[PDB]
Motif scaffolding. Structure first.
Motif, PDB file in Angstrom:
ATOM      1  N   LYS A   2       2.286  -0.767 -11.008  1.00 60.16           N
ATOM      2  CA  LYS A   2       3.468  -0.868 -10.196  1.00 60.16           C
ATOM      3  C   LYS A   2       4.639  -1.570 -10.886  1.00 60.16           C
ATOM      4  O   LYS A   2       4.439  -2.536 -11.612  1.00 60.16           O
ATOM      5  N   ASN A  26      11.364  -7.580  -5.883  1.00 60.74           N
ATOM      6  CA  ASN A  26      11.564  -6.275  -5.256  1.00 60.74           C
ATOM      7  C   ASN A  26      10.541  -5.304  -5.770  1.00 60.74           C
ATOM      8  O   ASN A  26      10.331  -5.142  -7.006  1.00 60.74           O
ATOM      9  N   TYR A  27       9.882  -4.594  -4.842  1.00 64.45           N
ATOM     10  CA  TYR A  27       8.893  -3.586  -5.175  1.00 64.45           C
ATOM     11  C   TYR A  27       9.186  -2.405  -4.215  1.00 64.45           C
ATOM     12  O   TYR A  27       9.162  -2.567  -2.993  1.00 64.45           O
ATOM     13  N   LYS A  28       9.605  -1.286  -4.783  1.00 67.83           N
ATOM     14  CA  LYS A  28      10.034  -0.133  -4.001  1.00 67.83           C
ATOM     15  C   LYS A  28      11.088  -0.555  -3.054  1.00 67.83           C
ATOM     16  O   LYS A  28      12.076  -1.190  -3.446  1.00 67.83           O
ATOM     17  N   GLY A  29      10.912  -0.215  -1.794  1.00 66.78           N
ATOM     18  CA  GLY A  29      11.914  -0.657  -0.861  1.00 66.78           C
ATOM     19  C   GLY A  29      11.705  -2.097  -0.365  1.00 66.78           C
ATOM     20  O   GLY A  29      12.519  -2.579   0.383  1.00 66.78           O
ATOM     21  N   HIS A  30      10.668  -2.805  -0.767  1.00 65.11           N
ATOM     22  CA  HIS A  30      10.461  -4.101  -0.153  1.00 65.11           C
ATOM     23  C   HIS A  30      11.039  -5.280  -0.971  1.00 65.11           C
ATOM     24  O   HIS A  30      11.203  -5.188  -2.160  1.00 65.11           O
ATOM     25  N   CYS A  62       0.835  -5.849 -13.645  1.00 61.90           N
ATOM     26  CA  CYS A  62       1.970  -5.062 -13.255  1.00 61.90           C
ATOM     27  C   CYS A  62       2.899  -4.842 -14.441  1.00 61.90           C
ATOM     28  O   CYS A  62       2.818  -5.564 -15.445  1.00 61.90           O
TER      29      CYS A  62
END
Length: 155
Positions: A2, A26-30, A62
């Motif tokens: 990820k 921040n990870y994708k939209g979160h 990651c």
């Protein structure tokens, strides 16, 4: 792996004095925000402790893009740690490196990930680097009581 974008900052009212750190991840939209404060520390300790805490919180290996404002941390990652490992984490005076507790934790946690380190070019960061500063300064200003048990006197 990820993709996580991590932004960090440390702040201290004094040298030494109450300090804090701020982290945005921040990870994708979160988005997750993290901060903490200590009663007596230094700016350099908080600048290291921010990425340490962010990296230690990741559950598995990651791919990361990590942006900080600290040329002290940068110096460590790009040149000092490598020499320190070969010298037993001692200085050229043959005494332990300053903040060795944190440098060791940073080195260890960084080894487990694929990291792309970025340094804020004074200071055109992303909005998140502002947000770190705000969170760090907030936590330092809030009369923090937590002890930084690795901050050594005279330090």
């Amino acid at each position: 792996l990820k993709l996580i974008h991590i932004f960090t900052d440390g702040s201290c009212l004094g040298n030494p004095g109450p300090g804090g750190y701020g982290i945005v991840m921040n990870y994708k939209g979160h988005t997750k925000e993290m901060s903490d404060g200590f009663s007596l520390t230094t700016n350099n300790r908080m600048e290291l402790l921010a990425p340490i805490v962010a990296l230690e919180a990741l559950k598995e290996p990651c791919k990361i893009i990590l942006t900080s404002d600290s040329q002290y941390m940068r110096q460590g990652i790009m040149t000092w740690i490598h020499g320190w490992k070969k010298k037993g984490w001692m200085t050229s005076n043959r005494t332990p490196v300053k903040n060795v507790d944190l440098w060791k934790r940073l080195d260890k946690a960084a080894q487990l990930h694929q990291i792309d380190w970025r340094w804020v070019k004074g200071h055109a960061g992303h909005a998140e680097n502002e947000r770190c500063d705000q969170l760090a300064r907030a936590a330092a200003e809030a009369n923090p009581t937590q002890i930084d048990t690795g901050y050594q006197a005279e330090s």
